[PDB]
Design a protein around this ligand. Sequence first.
Ligand SMILES: O=C(O)[C@H]1O[C@@H](O)[C@H](O)[C@@H](O)[C@H]1O
Ligand SMILES: O=C(O)[C@H]1O[C@@H](O)[C@H](O)[C@@H](O)[C@H]1O
Ligand SMILES: [Cl-]
Ligand SMILES: [Cl-]
Lengths: 584, 584
Amino acid sequence: TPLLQNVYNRESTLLNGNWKYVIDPYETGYRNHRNWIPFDQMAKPYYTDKVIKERWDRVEYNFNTSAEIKVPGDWNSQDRMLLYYEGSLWYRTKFDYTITDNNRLFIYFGAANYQTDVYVNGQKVGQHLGGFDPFNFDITNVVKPKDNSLMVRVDNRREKHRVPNYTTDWWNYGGITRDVKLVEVPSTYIQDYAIQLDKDNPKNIKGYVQLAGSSLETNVSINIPEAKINFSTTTDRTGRVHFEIPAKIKKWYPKRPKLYDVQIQAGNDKLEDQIGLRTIETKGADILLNGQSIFLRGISLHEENPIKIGRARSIEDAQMQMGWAKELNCNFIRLAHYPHNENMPRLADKLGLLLWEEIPVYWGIDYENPEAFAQAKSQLETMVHRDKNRASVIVWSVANETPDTESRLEFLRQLKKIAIDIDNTRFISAALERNEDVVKIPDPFAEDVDMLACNEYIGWYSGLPEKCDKVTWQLPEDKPFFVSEFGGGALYNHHGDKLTRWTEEYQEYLYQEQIKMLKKIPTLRGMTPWILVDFRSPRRNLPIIQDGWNRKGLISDGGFKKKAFHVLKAYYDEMEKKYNYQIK
Amino acid sequence: TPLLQNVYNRESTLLNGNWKYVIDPYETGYRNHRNWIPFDQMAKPYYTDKVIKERWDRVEYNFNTSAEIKVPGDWNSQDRMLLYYEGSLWYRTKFDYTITDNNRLFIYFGAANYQTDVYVNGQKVGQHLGGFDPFNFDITNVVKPKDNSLMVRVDNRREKHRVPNYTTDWWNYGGITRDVKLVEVPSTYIQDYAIQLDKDNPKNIKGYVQLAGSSLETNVSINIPEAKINFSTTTDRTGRVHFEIPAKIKKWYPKRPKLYDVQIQAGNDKLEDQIGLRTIETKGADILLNGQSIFLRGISLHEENPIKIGRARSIEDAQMQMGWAKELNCNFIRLAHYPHNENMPRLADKLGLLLWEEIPVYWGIDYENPEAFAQAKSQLETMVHRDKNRASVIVWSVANETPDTESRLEFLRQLKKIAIDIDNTRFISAALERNEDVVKIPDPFAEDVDMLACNEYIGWYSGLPEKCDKVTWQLPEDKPFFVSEFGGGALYNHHGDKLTRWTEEYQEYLYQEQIKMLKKIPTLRGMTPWILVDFRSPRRNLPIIQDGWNRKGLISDGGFKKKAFHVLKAYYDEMEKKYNYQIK
Ligand SMILES: O=C(O)[C@H]1O[C@@H](O)[C@H](O)[C@@H](O)[C@H]1O
Ligand SMILES: O=C(O)[C@H]1O[C@@H](O)[C@H](O)[C@@H](O)[C@H]1O
Ligand SMILES: [Cl-]
Ligand SMILES: [Cl-]
């Protein structure tokens, strides 16, 4: 079912709360135990949610008497038992709901990692693959006024074909990780819409409205009152209409993040949105936001709440993380290795932070495998579609650290085309790697990126920090350069000499030398050092230092600033001063 | 590396204790994170057991500072965090050993589930696939006098090609589940031997001795002093010699379990064994022990200590389980779906219990895959080799509840042949299923088995207990019949009506009706009901009743007898009087 645009501003019934759950490692409730075939495909299935009729009946499950779990949130941080659980878990709740007239009822999931199978009243309504991207199912025909069984199975088992697959550098947080809600919409409804400036013609707002449901030929209006902008017309059999409409509109900037109130209407459906308007482009080496030359003073960030040691999901998380970005004097954030919860780009639109958004194409994805390609494709489609009206987002990242194979090159070129054909307003990137005295990027996919993005750990994985000053970068003169990652591990309040690895002083030294090395590159235009805050990864098993944390944060797991924070902040204060500009 | 016979009686240095450990879900320590290839085949590898030399070096592990774990034991029962852990884990210890003269040093593992990779001083010494069968590696050339690093990786992740694979009805207990020890033997050592009554002429003892090492041509003696036997011979260049010694010998019977002290001696190597001498055979429908017709008053049993909720492993565990089998008036135990620890058959030798021993070819094994075959084969070979000198053991079981396909049938027939070529002296069987008024066993593999064993759950999975009496079994008049499983679930001290499922009264009633059904079958010569004591299974998810336990125990998880126990015992008291034999 296509993603409903801007469910963020529709009226919802949250299903959040305490649900029933069963841990099911051998998939006893999903699969025939003898032939491994899902029950879906042919009492026993846990999704029928039966109880006994008579005292001599046998049912080896009972959601009514099962343990409870909080929704939303990762299961891992909810019990020591679930910390390392990689596998399948049944969530069950009940709700009453009477649909008005001939409206449609959707269930909308902000995210759930990794495979989700959803059942209403013992009837399958949908499946989703991808751990971080939203999804919704029309459940209209399968509900009843009282006592609805809602069964959602989430499976986070690592599998060859999944994106990501066997290893990443972050914790496998399983379960329903973001809000779950019912959404009631008219028999015909606004399904999708793009309302952004034309990259070929910034005088015009260019986009479309896509209707869905019972009768798709109806009247559609887009109203931007404060701009005196109006468009209205008829839809045809397709429910789709394109428009190129001109806009005295005040443009969106970090320092001045103007959001226009927008009204989207079709038949009986009314929908309000907050949309900022701006152009992002390349002019040789320069990055131009609305014709003005900018520098991206950025930081990398995982979707994690380190005080909770679990998945971030809320507007409160979004405020705390962005308040830290602002103490660091950032105008930009590189978000995780996956789509974060929609509060991030929504709050970034309001506060004036530019964004980079990424799908988990990470390391050894099975590039030759149609199935893997299909999962990477639906995650990117879902991500670009969700956020294509967000002024804050200026980069879609398609891959991070991928092998230089023919298999791989075609995969990334195909993903580029999928992103471009939905949205052509933003930069297409991929976080790449270098090649070694002097540093080149011969990556053929570097021809295909609007902003040349590289990861590099010269002070940390390759040589000690004195190597940074010895190094000369060799780069195309006609394209912005961007460092999508550099940094170093340090345990907060572990102090010593600057050559003692894992001390704050070593990380401080590394950032100093790293900033001196990058300041020599004339085409440098931004960086998202790794990372703003320590985050969980099961690849980081040094006792006392790591204990399952990646320690490359500028901020500790407790929320305490390390010495390196002040090195980067001071450089960013300097870059703010240099690229300081006057708004029209 | 061939299994050392009768290490049970050889002098060993136990490596049991507290070991260092790291949980490693993404196999960070074992495989390259980019291409997934094991470091083994090409600092990073956890098995190099490195520490930093200077303070600027980087090593993202340190076993010296890592958390500690009890060896032996399953990991799941040692911490709530490990209960559902399915994956790889690193165990690490250190040891000093001076080998005397030109002797060899073996490390011996009673079991580790599922895949063990073993390293000494950063050198790979061996791999083992199979979760319940012992294995030993020659480490002579790789140890030093002091401060040896011993690194033991164990992975219990469920995989398609493994035996067992995706699901069973018992808990995936990972780790070093039995004693680990060092066994020093001379440069020429007794590797293997068989010593059993000649089935075809019980006046004689038949067998072979297999020597291994530097000089294979030497004197070999076998003394059985009490029996007046002082056999002596020489070996050829192969070290393998066959023999036919007359017997004066008091034969082994459950009611009189006579074991002989045996000394096997070759060059400087000397081994004591305790061996019982008996014949087991079939005459049409009759089971003949030393030519006396017997009945197998049995119970099924998993290798689990219910008080610990963890894996059974010790002589103390054996004493408890078999104490309970003796209270039930058993002369027979069906051991689980895997080889139990070697204390079971050795104590079964001492106390006079006969035993069925099994490999986990169980449900949907990948019967077309040669890898899966190889892994079933190596477990079968190991089991038969370990226990072929135990009088208690009379059945090798090759399968439990496997699908009637052509691949499975060839798979089981190959297994039977492999078993026969090592040991032809015991019954070959498998747990088969009925077909349904009248009950037949059309399984083509029924023709291949010395004892026809059927699992059936008529009063429980198929019908209510009243069905037992309505049903008529049609079986060969030719071959002894065996009920390898029947039973029902019941929560200890949950009481009510005999038609209230999960009560003790329902179980009592099912046992009464089931016993009345089987007493009618003239070819019936034994049964091992499912099961002696409640055991853990993640397939059993019924809150209040199950809570992760299979509840078909005749004994509760706390060790309390349910009513159904007193029914089987009274039936076994009857069968004891009806099959009364006088030993000559
Ligand atoms: O080395 C590092 O610290 C980082 O490199 C990145 O590519 C990866 O996304 C991170 O999660 C982390 O592994
Ligand atoms: O249904 C039952 O109780 C039993 O069936 C057996 O074949 C299986 O091996 C047992 O572990 C148990 O599941
Ligand atoms: Cl780190
Ligand atoms: Cl049960």
